[PDB]
Nucleic acid binder design. Structure first.
Ligand SMILES: [K+]
Ligand SMILES: [K+]
Ligand SMILES: [K+]
Ligand SMILES: [K+]
Ligand SMILES: [K+]
Ligand SMILES: [Mg+2]
Ligand SMILES: [Mg+2]
Ligand SMILES: [Mg+2]
Ligand SMILES: [Mg+2]
Ligand SMILES: [Mg+2]
Ligand SMILES: [Mg+2]
Ligand SMILES: [Mg+2]
Ligand SMILES: [Mg+2]
Ligand SMILES: [Mg+2]
Ligand SMILES: [Mg+2]
Ligand SMILES: [Mg+2]
Ligand SMILES: [Mg+2]
Ligand SMILES: [Mg+2]
Ligand SMILES: [Mg+2]
Ligand SMILES: [Mg+2]
Ligand SMILES: [Mg+2]
Ligand SMILES: [Mg+2]
Ligand SMILES: [Mg+2]
Ligand SMILES: [Mg+2]
Ligand SMILES: [Mg+2]
Ligand SMILES: [Mg+2]
Ligand SMILES: [Mg+2]
Ligand SMILES: [Mg+2]
Ligand code: NA
Ligand code: NA
Ligand SMILES: [Zn+2]
Lengths: 134, 220, 85, 52, 33, 32, 92, 89, 103
RNA sequence: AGGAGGGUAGUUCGGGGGAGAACGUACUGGUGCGUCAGAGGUGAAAUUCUUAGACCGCACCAAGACGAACUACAGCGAAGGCAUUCUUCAAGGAUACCUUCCUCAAUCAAGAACCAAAGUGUGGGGAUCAAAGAUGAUUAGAGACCAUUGUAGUCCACACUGC
RNA sequence: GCACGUUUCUUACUUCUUCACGCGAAAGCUUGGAGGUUACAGUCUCAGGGGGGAGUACGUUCGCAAGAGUGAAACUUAAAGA
């Protein structure tokens, strides 16, 4: 839908991949963060409420984004993964690897993978008691 | 349809970087009382130092630029800050040694205010056989003081463009390592992060000089 | 290494490594030096473990620097150890 | 406009020339928060917790 | 007591005022050279 | 389990039960 | 303190006067070597003493404590606003 | 504690007004009638003359202070804040 | 019956009074820092199959440039470290092996 | 005295103690732009928020707590305890000494001071977590374990308590 | 001047899974004792005397309260415990 650039010239966007233990986000923006091209989630492809974080649902979401991003005029993507974050697992969810592999195999170029998990340097108290979750 | 109202622009960096136009972006067109320039101004764009400046460890550095003027289909920017990327920082950490961190507040000659963060580690000698290389607290304080003075004096005489070149080409990093090693053996001294905390008021002439010749944009 | 130790007559090596007040008979560890500073040709006696301020009679300038342990002499000076008796 | 941000003041005029109408009870004061040089206005925190 | 206080105050303050004026003028001369 | 046989209810809760008993006796004697 | 130790030495083998009236008396007679003024001195009384010392060419030491501290530094149970030393003994 | 075990100055009230309200007013009453230190003349001679007004018996100086004590804790921090801010300019 | 000479932690007598607690990585239980089971984990972001497919598409990692990794310092409570098989019960006269380093 | 005390020195040593000024991300809540249909939570769900635009992305603002990784069979303290930087205030141990002094000592009924968390009183403050309480599940039942909330508390100043 | 390498010394927290006697019912302790004790004596001080009733009742001191210190017996049991 524009960008008036040569078909051999790479136009870069940024894809933010949020993979928790309950859902998965595939969000594509421009090189800043103030313009959004498309956003699909794992829960927009399944019905069982227990497969929202499944690797299959992540793969289906990534395929929808590629179809839409081709129309917009985006050829390549920078990658930013994150887990839940501050008071949270800090461990990436099951759908992170599937989403990135699906993007590459759908016909998109990749560059500069990075991790952007919050990681406090000193935090507030987290959920549970001093005896933990039982 | 959302894409039917969008227009494309080019983001161009100052002239102390080899690659001038390093990004593309979109914005809503002009309708009624809404003017696109009022929304484009103030955005913050991020780039990678390795892509901007050309095979070194610059692949882990990110530089941010804020938009200050709209020249047709071009966006003129200025330095906003830099950071180190977290995976690189975690890789430099080890056990059985001391980690030294310092925060330095400095100002340039054109009124910009900067805050800098440094990190360094103690190292074992080539023939050492002991189990650790922890440092005495007196030497740790001395390293912080000497590094603070060097940064303050070097930056107080430069404008924003020369100060950025000093930070992005590892001139200050090399000087700090040279003058701080005699206090205590150190490894992997880096400038972790730079924040811009003050900004002088806008000056069209100053921005024009900082950019020099501006490449043309094909959008339209 | 066949020789056996006698508690009343220790060997040179054994007694040399002992802390003072752990020897058979305790004694001092310090001595006196004959120090000549650069200029004024004057000779002054300085304690080895000196912690006070020591100046030559004429020049009225410092002659040694107190530390933890043995004092350190100024760069221009030279010294000769004095006999115990 | 001549008082640095973060200072403690009392007897503040709300109108130029009113000769003092705010923070006059026994142990009260205001706090200067910020200055706006473009419009020539100042922000204060009143003893009741409001901002003016 | 109050009369003596006023006399002492009048003389000493005026002398201090004269001292400052001479000091400032001399500083200006040194700058000039 | 980290303790040997207690021979009763948990000693913390037995202490609390006596704790409540002493209050009731104190209140009853206050009525007179 | 360095000054506190010297004052103790003067108290032992020197000559001195405590008080405003006696200090001015020694300044007029020109038998003063040093004048110590507490930080508590009223501004107009301090200005008078400093003027007298300039006329008589006598050095002034500005004490950091108040008259309560200066009085106890002389081994006294009362306050002293100014101290004038007329004869330094085995002190400095 | 010869004449009274614990009532102290509140012993003029007899057996009225309750124990805790008497205790709460005992702290403020003791300080309001005490002699405070004068930094102008170095004497313990400051006394209250109506709420907020303190006069020194030595140098005859009048100061505006707190209701029941010469200086409130809030005043000291404000003094240091202002002095630090002034020298900052 | 004293099972361990160090009582399961690393706090000799006459050394410290109190060690600050930390939250268990799994259940958020509070455990003293010297008693918890700590491991430093370095994890590849993608497995061998996915890394190969990503590298073909990327112009950066396409020619011998390492992919990023994940660094974490995980601390476990005793219950979570056993249930997750990080550690197992060991025979007597075997509980004394220490393994000061990796591997 | 290879018993006690005091002195001088390296302005030595250390998460030891008391004061100021600042710094760091994160949780929460707002503001400005973008996009559009779900988000959250679990073993599985439901209570809950959402086209009056939630979740997500960027930039910024406010307030309170907390100082990750480095961090250890390491340091300091009588014990309880103590972890960002800089500026200050008074202390403490060890070491060095051909300094001084000359039994000044050990342990202790009575007596004194300090003492984790919870708890109490009076003012501040209130972001997070969270006794009591509410709702959803699970169960034969479930006043519990799981989930969403939520008050006191959790933080500071001054007084108590002495488990 | 700052670290490292080598040899001694005083103070402190420790380890032997390639640590000796000795001691202990054993588990274990070991210059830092639980050693140097029927071959029983360096100095001072605080607690205990089968299990329960019970740290309960009564009296008294301290505390705003919650509580804290001091502290029995009548009865009942052939074991409880390491
Ligand atoms: K889910
Ligand atoms: K068991
Ligand atoms: K352990
Ligand atoms: K409270
Ligand atoms: K809860
Ligand atoms: Mg869901
Ligand atoms: Mg709960
Ligand atoms: Mg517990
Ligand atoms: Mg070391
Ligand atoms: Mg067992
Ligand atoms: Mg037992
Ligand atoms: Mg210790
Ligand atoms: Mg403890
Ligand atoms: Mg937010
Ligand atoms: Mg830290
Ligand atoms: Mg508490
Ligand atoms: Mg309250
Ligand atoms: Mg509670
Ligand atoms: Mg629960
Ligand atoms: Mg909650
Ligand atoms: Mg509190
Ligand atoms: Mg036995
Ligand atoms: Mg025994
Ligand atoms: Mg015997
Ligand atoms: Mg019995
Ligand atoms: Mg009573
Ligand atoms: Mg109460
Ligand atoms: Mg009791
Ligand atoms: Na809590
Ligand atoms: Na041993
Ligand atoms: Zn007065």
């Amino acid at each position: 839908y524009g960008s008036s650039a040569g078909k051999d010239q790479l136009v870069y966007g940024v894809v933010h991949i949020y993979a928790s233990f309950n859902d998965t986000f595939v969000h594509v923006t421009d090189m800043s963060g103030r313009e959004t091209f498309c956003k699909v989630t794992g829960g927009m492809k399944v019905k069982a409420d227990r497969d929202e974080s499944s690797p299959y649902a992540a793969m289906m979401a990534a395929q929808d984004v590629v179809a839409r991003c081709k129309e917009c005029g985006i050829n390549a993507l920078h990658v930013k993964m994150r887990a839940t974050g501050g008071v949270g697992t800090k461990s990436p969810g099951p759908g992170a690897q599937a989403a990135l592999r699906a993007l590459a195999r759908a016909g998109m170029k990749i560059g500069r993978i990075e991790d952007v998990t919050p990681v406090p340097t000193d935090s507030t108290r987290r959920k549970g008691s001093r005896r933990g979750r039982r | 349809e959302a894409m039917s109202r969008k227009e494309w622009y080019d983001v161009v960096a100052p002239k102390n970087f080899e690659v001038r136009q390093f990004a593309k972006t979109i914005c809503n067109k002009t309708q009624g009382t809404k003017i696109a320039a009022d929304f484009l101004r103030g955005r913050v764009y991020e780039g990678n130092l390795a892509d901007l400046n050309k095979n070194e460890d610059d692949a882990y550095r990110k530089v941010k630029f804020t938009v200050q003027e709209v020249q047709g289909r071009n966006l003129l920017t200025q330095f906003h800050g830099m950071d180190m990327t977290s995976d690189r920082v975690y890789y430099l950490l080890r056990k059985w040694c001391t980690t030294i961190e310092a925060t330095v507040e400095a100002k340039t000659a054109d009124g910009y205010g900067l805050r800098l963060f440094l990190i360094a580690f103690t190292k074992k000698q080539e023939n050492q056989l002991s189990k650790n290389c922890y440092a005495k607290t007196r030497l740790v304080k001395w390293v912080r003081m000497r590094a603070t003075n060097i940064i303050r004096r070097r930056l107080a005489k430069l404008d924003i463009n020369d100060a950025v070149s000093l930070l992005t080409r590892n001139i200050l990093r090399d000087r700090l390592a040279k003058r701080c090693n005699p206090i205590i053996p150190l490894r992997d001294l880096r400038i972790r992060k730079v924040k811009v905390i003050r900004t002088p008021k806008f000056d069209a002439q100053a921005l024009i000089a900082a950019h020099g010749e501006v490449p043309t944009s094909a959008e339209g | 290494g066949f020789f056996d130790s006698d508690l009343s007559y220790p060997t040179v090596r054994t007694e040399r490594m002992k802390h003072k007040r752990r020897r058979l008979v305790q004694g001092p560890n310090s001595y006196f030096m004959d120090v000549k500073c650069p200029g004024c040709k004057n000779i002054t006696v300085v304690y080895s473990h000196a912690t006070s301020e020591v100046k030559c009679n004429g020049c009225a300038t410092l002659l040694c620097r107190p530390t933890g342990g043995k004092a350190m002499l100024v760069t221009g000076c030279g010294f000769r150890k004095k006999p115990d008796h | 406009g001549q008082i640095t941000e973060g200072c403690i003041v009392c007897n503040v005029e709300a109108k130029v020339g009113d000769r003092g109408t705010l923070a006059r009870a026994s142990g009260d004061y205001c706090i200067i928060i910020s200055h706006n040089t473009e419009t020539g206005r100042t922000r204060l925190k009143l003893p009741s917790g409001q901002k003016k | 007591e109050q009369v003596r206080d006023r006399i002492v105050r009048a003389f000493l303050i005026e002398e201090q005022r004269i001292v400052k004026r001479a000091l400032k003028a001399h500083a200006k001369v040194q700058k000039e050279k | 389990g980290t303790i040997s046989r207690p021979g009763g209810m948990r000693p913390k809760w037995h202490k609390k039960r006596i704790k409540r008993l002493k209050r009731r006796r104190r209140r009853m004697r206050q009525r007179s | 303190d360095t000054i506190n130790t010297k004052i103790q030495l003067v108290m032992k083998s020197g000559k001195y006067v405590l008080g405003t009236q006696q200090s001015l008396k020694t300044l007029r007679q020109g038998r003063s070597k040093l004048v110590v003024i507490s930080a508590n001195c009223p501004p107009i009384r301090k200005a008078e003493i400093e003027y007298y010392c300039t006329l008589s060419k006598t050095p002034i030491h500005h004490y950091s404590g108040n008259n309560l501290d200066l009085g106890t530094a002389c081994g006294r149970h009362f306050r002293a606003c100014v101290l004038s030393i007329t004869d330094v003994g085995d002190s400095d | 504690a010869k004449r009274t075990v614990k009532m102290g100055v509140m012993g003029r009230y007899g057996a009225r007004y309750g124990s805790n309200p008497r205790k709460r007013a005992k702290k403020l009453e003791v300080s309001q009638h005490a002699k405070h230190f004068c930094s102008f003349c170095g004497k313990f001679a400051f006394r209250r003359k109506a709420v907020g007004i303190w006069r020194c018996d030595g140098c005859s100086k009048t100061v505006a202070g707190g209701a029941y004590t010469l200086s409130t804790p809030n005043n000291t921090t404000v003094r240091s804040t202002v002095r630090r801010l002034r020298e900052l300019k | 019956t004293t099972k361990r000479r160090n009582h399961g932690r690393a706090k000799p007598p006459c050394s410290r009074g109190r060690v600050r607690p930390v939250h268990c990585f799994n259940c958020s239980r509070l455990v003293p820092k010297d008693k918890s089971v700590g491991r430093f984990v370095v994890r590849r972001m993608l497995d061998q199959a996915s890394a190969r497919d990503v590298a073909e598409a990327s112009l950066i990692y396409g020619s011998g440039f390492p992919m990023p990794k994940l660094y974490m310092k995980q601390r476990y409570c005793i219950a979570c470290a056993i249930h997750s098989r990080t550690v197992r019960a060991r025979p007597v006269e075997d509980r004394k092996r220490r393994y000061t380093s990796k591997v």
